[PDB]
Design brief:
part of a larger assembly, 9 chains, A mainly alpha (about 35), B mainly alpha (about 100), C mainly alpha (about 55), D mainly alpha (about 325), E mainly alpha (about 30), F mainly alpha (about 25), G mainly alpha (about 140), H mainly beta (about 240), I mainly alpha (about 450), F: about 25 residues, mainly alpha, I: about 450 residues, Arc Repressor Mutant, subunit A, 13 helices, binds digalactosyl diacyl glycerol (dgdg), binds chlorophyll A, herbicide resistance (chain D), oxidoreductase activity, acting on diphenols and related substances as donors, oxygen as acceptor (chain D)
């Protein structure tokens, strides 16, 4: 468990580790937006 | 003339009671008060010539003696069978669950 | 007997397929037409597949 | 005229009937050693105490095996992962009893096969080819590393590496299933898809090309004589073949780029076999196949068996029987 | 007799390898 | 829930492409 | 079939008083059994000593009888060998030995009842499988 | 000073018994009022001889040499037991406990493997009468027990055993079983061996002794399947004596 | 000429944009390190061993002496939070520089500054960048030394009394020891560098490596490659990439074996027992149980004729029996008190086994690194109940996979760099096909 005064952020921290995956996905949205050029 | 001595033993009282001279120690869990402490002593002081010999095990408290008394009828003795007592097999005979 | 005849029946199925293929496709056993043009295999040209009387 | 430079020129010569090369300077002796020892041991080695329990298993022909049952038997579990060369035995008799030949053969072979892969790179460079055929071979190579070296390292014993024999192989794969549930592991499932698919696409590709051969021959000659080695023209009609396969399925599920097509052919089995080699390599560290044992229960809590629980009954019968004299304690932890 | 047979066949396969490689029909261009 | 935050975070990236493509930018 | 009150009714003590658990208590017991006990006692066996299991009939023959909520709660506080002759708090988790078994630290009295109840219910649901081992998987 | 595990591991020394200085030619006096134990008895074989089969009448085969194939796994050690004084001044060692067996297999010329259970289990070995001191001429002679090499759970390659396993040749469902009786019915043997221990060195201060042993016993009979061979083992021993 | 799916190869000669990719990606590494730590912390429950909870980062921090006390008990979680927050915060700075250099900064650097710009074919400049990074790396290995010797020490599983944090006051400098490890066999009972079993050798090894990297770095700033190296190598960006992929692959394979066999810098208190450990602990457990019932474990012959509990290794040492005969090279703090010079000591086994050792064996036997992909713990035939896969299985398998693919990447990029440097990576020139100018083989 996190320190008491950051407890509010618990559900954010459950999701943070996944964020690097989203960068990979985001490169494919970008390439879709320029038509895989 | 070639006979399996373990099968032969299942045809004696060994196949229906706890044999104090042959039976693996985990059988002593089938009756109350006997395992581990008295089971340990019974196996260490085997062989017995009759079932009541177990009461003459040095160190038995009178409670322990009483437990044995209650349970003398679940006990038997047959001749020691080398195949059942070698290998430490009365303490661990390779059967678990 | 069952083993032999079940096995021979299965093998003879391939024989049916082989010689039937050879009968219906005898005209190209040795290879396809070296003057088959790309309009006959490309989509659209003919309304009916392979029928050259249905050109659009 | 320099002696070293002449020798370099011969090692790397593209005129040798078999390319040697620097990778071949290591591959040639290591593979000859492994081959000569394998053949001698398959025919004449005496029984080997694979599981360390002084219960020797007979692998060779002269000791009552046939081709199917014979094997060079893995080295004794008493040895574990210890290095056991000939010169560490008090005698050849001892070394044979304890499974020394298996170590000699697999170390020499894995080295020679590694160099085989490099040799594939090397000659491609001397011929001015593109370089990645060796990358295709890394799939079978990684698979042999997995069953001869990686799985032993994780389980702690070359006695659990794959016997060098036909029935020995099957023993290894039955015991693997009991200890790892490999069939319920997705990397073995990708391996099956890699190998099934590879055979599918092999047949597909062969049949589509064969189907569109250009008539160059009469019905009295093999069509194979319609192609002459080194002719410049393609020998089939990819557009007729694309037009057949696009109609069997639909157009955009068919390749008309022959480069994309053959890359697809290369990549599908290679990648599937990468995964299944990685499956063995990671079940080496006991990250096993999915376990759905008793995953379905009813409203009361009764277990409701599924096909996974039936698999588990089979796995149990393998487990309880294998190496039947070798376990003294209730968990087979390795 | 069965050992002799198994080894005999394997030996023939190795000899075939030698002829297949060094005494092949040479591929000739065009 | 956590489904609120990963929704908010998940939309950031694509919203950047969207802003840059409608404001015809250096994509 | 379902988790009827009949099945959630287990003995409270040696005097044949009974107690009817809730479905809630039982699922809590099961959860707590997996937390603190199942690493050794999965399926009602004992991995580090297979000769002693959690079958009701085995517990009934333990000294202090353990086929009841009281016996089992006491066991989780002050475990003895099967004949009651020695205390084994130092090699068996218990509240008495929660310094060396820290998972036991945060267990309340109500948690102990639920665990005990789970252990006594499960063989009514699963029968021979409970404590029977791999033969019954 | 003495060696640690990490000095020993991997060397072979762990299979070797302690030696005494060739200067240890003392005498260990024995007081009949006192009781003694042997704290450690170590037996290290050096030579395994097997008796051949002459196939003929009056030749009586010879003991021939063999090669060890099971490596440095042969020594008996940590054996302890009563050392008694008898009415007539003989000493009797009674073995109580120890690592008192090793399986060994040796290979005869021609390739035959001969497994044996090298053991002193239940050893009772006695001296001559009137000892009073243990010296560089004391001999212990005794006998011991040789249980079956395999114990009762052992399953042969077709799943047959004594306390476990099949009772028939299940791959031959309708064979005549009389021929297979000897392979199908496992039997648990229990034979005696003999041993002499010859004390050649004595540390009168510390109570350590050392010398030479020779034992005769039977090899494995594979639970009745075949007849045992006769085996003679030679080696060196070490023991430390304590006032018990 | 590269397609979208090879699109980062478009960066080879755009040193500015390529700097941005490297630094943006550096930020993702640091982001993951931070985010993941906080995730493990928010889930951490100190009553439960780390290894029952899926932790891989908190064990690395605790191994360094932060957060823990005697026995590996966690006393203070604040050090973990700090490590997470600081990594998290720092990734915004790398993120910032990353996307600035990838999108807005100059796309090439060599016009803006001759110091930061580089040509791949410039051997002097390349070894200078290499030199700088060699110095950074040497500094980093010295930070580990500093921690161990001047800022609180390291967790020492071998410390007497259950393990503890210990300050390292006599790091091993004797190069016969330090480099002795490099020359040990990688086979069983030896273990190459994976067998390092004490923190004195760990810290001393890092003094050496730090000094070697700093010396190596200065060496490469001041020199250019000798002619023999000039002629041995391909000098191109993709070639250097291929060299480092090979080196990462080698290192991934070593890390795999480290976390699988080594219980010193991967203490079993945090990471769980190793495979050999768990299996040794099973035999210990049942030796104890059986001896308590009266069994004479030294004289008990098992089914095979070998000892049921105790046997000899091939060099004679007294070792545990059963299949674990194979793991007799195992060494651990709970087991070593029973070892005498000839291996396990029968008189210590009979008289001196302690309750904490019985507890530890039972714990390690029931947390063996065996489990299913969906994290059902134990052997593959076990029923559902225990949610456990050892962190060592997770860390071993993941890094085997990564090491394997980086070896494939090495071969990919190495063969391609060779081909591109010779000018036939795009195919065979029809008008100058080399084999058509070679004589036939036969
Ligand atoms: C550049 C070109 C390279 C050329 C190199 C050619 C020579 C080497 C070839 C590799 C052979 C490796 C065999 C590994 C054997 C094994 O026992 O390896 C494991 C050893 C670890 O050894 C173990 O190390 C242990 C160390 O722990 C000891 O000490 C510990 C300290 O805490 C603990 O106390 C522990 O309990 C105690 O036992 C013990 O010594 C064990 O007995 C011993 O087995 O690992 C170590 O050497 C780490 C070595 C990692 C290499 C293995 C990876 C191989 C991957 C092949 C990739 C294939 C890819 C296919 C391509 C297609
Ligand atoms: C061409 C054709 C080729 C096709 C081949 C494709 C490969 C097949 C892969 C898909 C198969 C997945 C089926 C769905 C599995 C399911 O939903 O599985 C669910 C499982 C979770 O299982 C649950 O696991 C639970 C675990 O229990 C344990 O834990 C519980 C608490 O969690 C309790 O404590 C319980 O007591 C304890 O036993 C119980 O078993 C439940 O009953 C069970 O449903 O998911 C997990 O494990 C999740 C983590 C594992 C997922 C990883 C999937 C692997 C995909 C890799 C594919 C290769 C990718 C390559 C990339 C490039
Ligand atoms: C330090 C590591 C490193 C670096 C910097 C590079 C860099 C490069 N590589 Mg090499 N590569 C590497 C490792 C590396 N590689 C490894 C380890 C392998 C073996 C697998 C390869 C194999 C490889 C091939 C086969 C090729 C390259 C190529 C290239 C170039 C273009 C790459 C590109 O645009 O990818 C663009 C990125 C993608 C197309 C995305 C790929 C996505 C992967 C396959 C799936 C990852 C999914 C993940 C596991 C989990 C997903 C979860 C889900 C939610 C999505 C570039 C120079 C190309 C080349 O030769 O350039 C000249 C080329 O053809 N790479
Ligand atoms: C670690 C992953 C990684 C990284 C760091 C890069 C980085 C880069 N790529 Mg590669 N690439 C990747 C993965 C990656 N790529 C993958 C997986 C693929 C396959 C789909 C490609 C395919 C690819 C192609 C096809 C090309 C590149 C190109 C480029 C460069 C220019 C891109 C550009 O102009 O963006 C334009 C995009 C935008 C303006 C949209 C917004 C992008 C931003 C950066 C998103 C970041 C959001 C973030 C949350 C903000 C935090 C900020 C805060 C810290 C202040 C850049 C250096 C190009 C190149 O080499 O140019 C010559 C190019 O042509 N890449
Ligand atoms: C690279 C090393 C690595 C390792 C060894 C682990 C290992 C672990 N993680 Mg961590 N994780 C990692 C990277 C890593 N992760 C990354 C990159 C992320 C960002 C997404 C996370 C995010 C993450 C979360 C959010 C959680 C874990 C959890 C866990 C544990 C359970 C894993 C599980 O069930 O997976 C199940 C298996 C799979 C999903 C199989 C993946 C197969 C891949 C896609 C195929 C490979 C293709 C090539 C690469 C385990 C200790 C869990 C835990 O217990 O936390 C305390 C948890 O909740 N991890
Ligand atoms: C290794 C990574 C790296 C490299 C090689 C470069 C290189 C460069 N950058 Mg970039 N940059 C980086 C990271 C990097 N940057 C990061 C992380 C950020 C965000 C903080 C930026 C933000 C940035 C901006 C906004 C600009 C540059 C610019 C420049 C150029 C000149 C900078 C100058 O004059 O020095 C300045 C030198 C100093 C300030 C000396 C102080 C030393 C540093 C800051 C402290 C030491 C840090 C330490 C070693 C590691 C971090 C500690 C941590 C581990 C706790 C040069 C090509 C400029 C450019 O391209 O314009 C055309 C420009 O405008 N950079
Ligand atoms: C990241 C690390 C790194 C890298 C990439 C380089 C790269 C380079 N170095 Mg530098 N070097 C480094 C660190 C590094 N160095 C450090 C720390 C030092 C200080 C000790 C040096 C000292 C140094 C010197 C003194 C020289 C170089 C030279 C060179 C060049 C030729 C290297 C070569 O051919 O080696 C390939 C290796 C060989 C040809 C033979 C040795 C092969 C090894 C020993 C075999 C071991 C294999 C085995 C399986 C691995 C297990 C471990 C083993 C110990 C048992 C090249 C540019 C040369 C040069 O041109 O400098 C200007 C040169 O003479 N380096
Ligand atoms: C291994 C580390 C164990 C854990 C964790 C738990 N138990 Fe256990 N238990 C274990 C052993 C080795 C034994 C036998 C003790 C002996 O007499 O030698 C036991 C015994 C019990 C019993 C008694 C069973 C009987 O038939 O009398 C009970 C009721 C029991 N254990 C319960 C229990 C609970 C509730 C646990 C979770 C908190 C738990 N055990 C953990 C080994 C281990
Ligand atoms: C730490 C933190 C933070 C940060 C954040 C971030 C950093 C984020 C990022 C973000 C991102 C980075 C995101 C992204 C996203 C992405 C996505 C969402 C994607 C998706 C995609 C898809 C879905 C795809 C699809 C497709 C295509 C496109 C094409 C091909 C096909 C397919 C189908 C695949 C904040 C501020 C919150 C604050 C707090 C803390
Ligand atoms: C270039 C490019 C790319 C890439 C990108 C990248 C990779 C980026 C990075 C970035 C990053 C890497 C970012 C980062 C960020 C960060 C942030 C922004 C952070 C924040 C933080 C915070 C705010 C914190 C908070 C807190 C605290 C303090 C305490 C605890 C709790 C919490 C967590 C809440 C792509 C491929 C897409 C595309 C193309 C181009
Ligand atoms: C820290 C530490 C330590 C230490 C360590 C060290 C000190 C290390 C070192 C190491 C090293 C010292 C390394 C090595 C390396 C090397 C290598 C890895 C090499 C490679 C090579 C190559 C790769 C080559 C190649 C080639 C050839 C062969 C030919 C020509 C071409 C070329 C060049 C390519 C210890 C353990 C104590 C402990 C723990 C910690
Ligand atoms: O060796 Mn071949 O197999 Ca792998 O677990 Mn433990 O160990 Mn043995 O038993 Mn199941
Ligand atoms: Cl098997
Ligand atoms: Cl075992
Ligand atoms: Fe083709």
């Amino acid at each position: 468990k996190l320190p008491e005064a950051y407890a509010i952020f618990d559900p954010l921290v459950d999701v943070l580790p996944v964020i690097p995956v989203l960068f990979l996905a985001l490169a494919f949205v970008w390439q879709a937006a320029v038509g895989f050029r | 003339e070639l006979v399996n001595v373990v099968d032969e033993k299942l045809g004696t009282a060994y196949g229906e009671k706890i044999d104090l001279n042959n039976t693996n120690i985990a059988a002593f869990i089938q009756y109350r008060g006997l395992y581990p402490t008295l089971a340990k002593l019974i196996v260490k002081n085997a062989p017995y010539e009759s079932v009541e010999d177990v009461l003459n095990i040095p160190g038995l408290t009178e409670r322990q003696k009483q437990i044995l008394r209650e349970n003398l009828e679940h006990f038997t003795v047959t001749e020691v069978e080398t195949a059942l007592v070698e290998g430490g097999d009365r303490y661990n005979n390779g059967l678990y669950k | 007997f069952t083993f032999a005849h079940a096995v021979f029946a299965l093998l003879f199925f391939f024989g049916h397929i082989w010689h039937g293929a050879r009968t219906l496709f005898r005209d190209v056993f040795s290879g396809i037409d070296p003057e088959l043009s790309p309009e006959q295999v490309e989509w659209g040209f003919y309304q009916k597949v392979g029928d050259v009387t249905t050109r659009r | 005229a320099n002696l070293w430079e002449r020798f370099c020129n011969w090692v790397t010569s593209t005129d040798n009937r078999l390319y040697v090369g620097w990778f071949g300077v290591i591959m040639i002796p290591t593979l000859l050693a492994a081959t000569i020892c394998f053949v001698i041991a398959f025919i004449a080695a005496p029984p080997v105490d694979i599981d360390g329990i002084r219960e020797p298993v007979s692998g060779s022909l002269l000791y009552g095996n046939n081709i199917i049952t014979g094997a060079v038997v893995p080295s004794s579990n008493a040895i574990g992962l210890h290095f056991y060369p000939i010169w560490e035995a008090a005698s050849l008799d001892e070394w044979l009893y304890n499974g020394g030949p298996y170590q000699l053969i697999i170390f020499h072979f894995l080295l020679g096969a590694s160099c085989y892969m490099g040799r594939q790179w090397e000659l491609s460079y001397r011929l001015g080819m593109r370089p990645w055929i060796c990358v295709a071979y890394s799939a079978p190579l990684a698979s042999a590393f997995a069953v001869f070296l990686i799985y032993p390292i994780g389980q702690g014993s070359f006695s659990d590496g794959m016997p060098l024999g036909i029935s020995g192989t099957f023993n290894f794969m039955i015991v693997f299933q009991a200890e790892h549930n490999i069939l319920m592991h997705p990397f073995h499932q990708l391996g099956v898809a890699g190998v099934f698919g590879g055979a599918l696409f092999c047949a597909m590709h062969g049949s589509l090309v064969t189907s569109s051969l250009i008539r160059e021959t009469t019905e009295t000659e093999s069509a194979n004589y319609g192609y002459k080695f080194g002719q410049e023209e393609e020998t089939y009609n990819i557009v007729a073949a694309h037009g057949y396969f696009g109609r069997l399925i639909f157009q955009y599920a068919s390749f008309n780029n022959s480069r994309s097509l053959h890359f697809f052919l290369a990549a599908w089995p290679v990648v599937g076999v990468w995964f299944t080699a990685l499956g063995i390599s990671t079940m080496a560290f006991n990250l096993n196949g999915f376990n759905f044992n008793h995953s379905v229960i009813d409203a009361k809590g009764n277990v409701i068996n599924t096909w996974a629980d039936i698999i588990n009954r089979a796995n149990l019968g393998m487990e309880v029987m294998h190496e039947r004299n070798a376990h003294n304690f209730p968990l087979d932890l390795a | 007799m069965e050992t002799i047979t198994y080894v005999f066949i394997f030996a023939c396969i190795i000899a075939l390898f030698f002829f297949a490689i060094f005494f092949r029909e040479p591929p000739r261009i065009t | 829930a956590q489904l609120t935050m990963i929704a908010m975070i998940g939309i950031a990236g694509p919203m950047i492409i969207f802003l840059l493509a409608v404001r015809r930018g250096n994509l | 079939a379902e988790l009827t009150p009949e099945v959630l009714t287990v003995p409270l003590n040696s005097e044949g008083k009974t107690i009817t658990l809730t479905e809630k208590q039982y699922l809590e017991g099961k959860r707590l059994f997996q937390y603190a006990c199942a690493s050794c006692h999965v399926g009602g066996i004992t991995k580090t000593n297979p000769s002693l299991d959690l079958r009701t009939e085995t517990l009934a023959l333990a000294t202090p009888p353990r086929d009841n909520i009281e016996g089992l709660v006491d066991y989780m506080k002050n475990p003895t060998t099967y004949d009651g002759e020695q205390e084994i708090a130092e090699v068996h988790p218990s509240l008495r030995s929660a310094d060396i078994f820290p998972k036991m630290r945060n267990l309340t009295e109500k948690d102990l009842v639920a665990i005990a109840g789970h252990i006594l219910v499960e063989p009514k649901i699963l029968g021979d499988k409970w404590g029977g081992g791999k033969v019954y998987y | 000073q003495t060696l640690t595990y990490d000095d020993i591991v991997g060397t072979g020394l762990a299979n070797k018994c302690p030696t005494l200085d060739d200067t240890a030619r003392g005498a260990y006096p024995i007081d009949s009022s006192q009781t003694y134990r042997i704290a450690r008895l170590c037996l290290q074989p050096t030579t395994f001889l097997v008796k051949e089969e002459p196939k003929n009448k009056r030749q009586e085969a010879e003991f021939v040499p063999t090669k060890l194939v099971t490596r440095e796994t042969t020594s008996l050690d940590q054996i302890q037991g009563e050392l008694k004084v008898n009415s007539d001044g003989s000493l009797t060692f009674v073995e109580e406990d120890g690592i008192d067996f090793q399986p060994v297999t040796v290979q005869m010329a021609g390739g035959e493997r001969i497994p044996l259970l090298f053991t002193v289990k239940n050893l009772v070995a006695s001296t001559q009468p009137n000892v009073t001191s243990i010296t560089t001429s004391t001999d212990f002679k005794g006998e011991f027990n040789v249980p079956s090499y395999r114990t009762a759970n052992f399953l042969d390659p077709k799943g047959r055993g004594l306390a476990s396993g099949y009772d028939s040749a299940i791959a031959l469902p309708q064979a005549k079983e009389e021929e297979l009786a000897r392979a199908n019915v496992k039997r648990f043997s229990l034979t005696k061996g003999q041993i002499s221990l010859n004390v050649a060195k004595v540390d009168g201060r510390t109570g350590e002794i050392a010398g030479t042993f020779e034992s005769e016993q039977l090899s494995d009979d594979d639970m009745g399947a075949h007849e045992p061979h006769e085996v003679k083992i030679q080696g060196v021993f070490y023991a430390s004596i304590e006032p018990a | 000429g590269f397609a979208w799916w090879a699109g980062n190869a478009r960066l080879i000669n755009l040193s500015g944009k390529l700097l941005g990719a490297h630094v943006a990606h550096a930020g993702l590494i640091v982001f993951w390190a931070g985010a993941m730590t906080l995730f493990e912390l928010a889930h951490f429950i100190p009553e439960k061993p780390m290894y029952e909870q899926g932790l891989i980062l908190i064990p690395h921090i605790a191994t360094l002496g932060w957060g823990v006390g005697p026995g590996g008990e966690v006393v203070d979680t604040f050090p973990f939070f700090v490590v997470g927050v600081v990594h998290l915060i720092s990734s915004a700075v790398l993120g910032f520089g990353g996307v600035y250099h990838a999108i807005r900064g100059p796309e090439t650097l060599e016009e803006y500054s001759s110091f930061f710009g580089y040509d791949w074919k410039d051997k002097n400049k390349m070894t200078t960048i290499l030199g700088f990074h060699l110095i950074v790396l040497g500094i980093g290995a010295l930070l580990l030394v500093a921690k161990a010797m001047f800022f609180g020490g390291l967790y020492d599983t071998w410390a007497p009394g259950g393990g503890d944090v210990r300050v390292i006051t006599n790091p091993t400098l004797d190069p016969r020891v330090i480099f002795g490890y490099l020359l040990k066999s990688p086979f069983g009972g030896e273990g190459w560098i994976v067998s390092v079993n004490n923190l004195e050798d760990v810290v001393g090894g890092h003094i050496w490596i730090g000094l070697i990297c700093i010396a190596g770095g200065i060496w490469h700033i001041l020199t250019t490659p000798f002619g023999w190296a000039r002629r041995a190598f391909i000098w191109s960006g993709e070639a250097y990439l291929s060299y480092s992929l090979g080196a990462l692959s080698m290192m991934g394979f070593i890390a795999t074996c480290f976390v699988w066999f080594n219980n010193t810098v991967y203490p079993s208190e945090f990471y769980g027992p190793t495979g050999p450990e768990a299996s040794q602990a099973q035999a210990m457990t049942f030796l104890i149980r059986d001896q308590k019932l009266g069994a004479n474990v030294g004289s008990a012959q098992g089914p095979t004729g070998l000892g049921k509990y105790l046997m000899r290794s091939p060099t004679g040492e007294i070792i545990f029996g059963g299949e674990t005969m194979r793991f007799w090279d195992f060494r651990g703090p709970w087991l070593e008190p029973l070892r005498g010079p000839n291996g396990l000591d029968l008189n210590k086994i009979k008289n001196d086994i302690q309750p904490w050792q019985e507890r530890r064996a039972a714990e390690y036997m029931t947390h063996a690194p065996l489990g299913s992909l969906n994290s059902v713990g134990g052997v593959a035939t076990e029923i559902n109940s225990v949610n456990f896969v050892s962190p060592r299985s997770w860390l071993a398998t993941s890094h085997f996979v990564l090491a394997f693919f980086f070896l494939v990447g090495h071969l990919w990029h190495a063969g391609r760099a060779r081909a591109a440097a010779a000018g036939f990576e795009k195919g065979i020139d029809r008008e100058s096909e080399p084999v058509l100018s070679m004589p036939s083989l036969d």
